[PDB]
């Protein structure tokens, strides 16, 4: 496995934490919301 995204240039979108790739928004959109899925439970990084 290495970096791919290949065909008629990148994906009609675009991540805005990591900048990932997504056909379709409706995909993106979701995505988008597992970078800001943290519970105060666990601990945190300095
Ligand atoms: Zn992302």
């Given at each position: 496995g290495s970096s791919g995204s290949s065909?008629?240039?990148?994906?009609?979108f675009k991540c805005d934490i990591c900048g990932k790739s997504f056909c379709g928004r409706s995909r993106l959109n979701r995505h988008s919301m597992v970078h800001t899925a943290?519970?105060?439970s666990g601990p945190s990084s300095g």
């Amino acid at each position: 496995g290495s970096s791919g995204s290949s065909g008629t240039g990148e994906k009609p979108f675009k991540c805005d934490i990591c900048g990932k790739s997504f056909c379709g928004r409706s995909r993106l959109n979701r995505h988008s919301m597992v970078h800001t899925a943290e519970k105060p439970s666990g601990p945190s990084s300095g």
